[PDB]
Amino acid sequence: GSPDPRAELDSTVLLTRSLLADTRQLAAQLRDKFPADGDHNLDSLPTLPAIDYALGALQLPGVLTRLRADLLSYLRHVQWLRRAGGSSLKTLEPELGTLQARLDRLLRRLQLLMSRLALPQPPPDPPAPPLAPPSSAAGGIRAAHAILGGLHLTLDWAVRGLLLLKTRL
């Protein structure tokens, strides 16, 4: 019947938290295997979404639309990573592929949430060209740290924004 937005948000936030946990674990696996010099630029990829720290600005339709766009970008980068990452990354390949599948599940839940709540369809941003292969095996590892680190932050700030937004419904 008629949807309860608080329940729809709850189930969407819960699923987001699970993906956040998966991402946090995989980033830790990678860091444990490549401690290197500590940390590298999360800006090591200019093609990834920027992190939106501005809470209280956007409303629910806008927050959801931008999250959908961000997640689709992360899915593109994860798919790219699994293909051209190199031998160094294939020890993470099962977890990466499961992360990609759960990323798709969250995208579908967001699409369902927007349909159930009658929120106008997000305008499709034109398609970015294919991601070029990393210039080196090290470059692929740096890309993996940036992709997983950025996804974690995106999901963390989405949970925060959706919970503070639900507080007012």
Side-chain angles (χ1 to χ4, degrees), residues 3-100:
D4 182 351
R6 300 160 304 181
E8 288 289 312
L9 283 168
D10 276 335
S11 70
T12 298
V13 167
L14 284 168
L15 183 57
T16 304
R17 290 186 186 277
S18 300
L19 190 68
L20 179 59
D22 290 327
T23 303
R24 174 174 68 222
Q25 297 168 20
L26 198 47
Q29 288 186 20
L30 181 65
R31 193 156 37 256
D32 172 284
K33 195 199 302 165
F34 301 113
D37 51 60
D39 187 309
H40 214 286
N41 307 342
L42 310 185
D43 310 84
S44 188
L45 264 45
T47 50
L48 287 173
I51 302 304
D52 183 11
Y53 296 101
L55 301 187
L58 295 175
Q59 298 267 4
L60 175 63
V63 164
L64 294 175
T65 295
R66 164 157 193 173
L67 178 59
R68 180 194 168 263
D70 294 354
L71 292 175
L72 256 166
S73 180
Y74 285 112
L75 182 143
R76 286 204 53 180
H77 283 78
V78 167
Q79 181 169 72
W80 166 79
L81 199 60
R82 297 169 64 207
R83 289 188 152 270
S87 277
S88 297
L89 286 292
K90 288 307 187 296
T91 278
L92 310 190
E93 164 54 350
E95 287 100 356
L96 265 176
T98 303
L99 188 70
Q100 182 178 315

Side-chain angles (χ1 to χ4, degrees), residues 80-149:
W80 166 79
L81 199 60
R82 297 169 64 207
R83 289 188 152 270
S87 277
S88 297
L89 286 292
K90 288 307 187 296
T91 278
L92 310 190
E93 164 54 350
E95 287 100 356
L96 265 176
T98 303
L99 188 70
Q100 182 178 315
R102 300 174 116 274
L103 217 39
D104 264 328
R105 187 166 309 116
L106 179 54
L107 290 171
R108 286 196 305 275
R109 188 70 187 84
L110 291 176
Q111 202 74 227
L112 184 66
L113 168 55
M114 293 194 286
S115 181
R116 281 176 171 173
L117 298 183
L119 300 170
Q121 192 69 24
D125 201 73
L131 293 172
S135 57
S136 69
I141 295 153
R142 298 194 265 95
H145 281 113
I147 292 162
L148 298 173

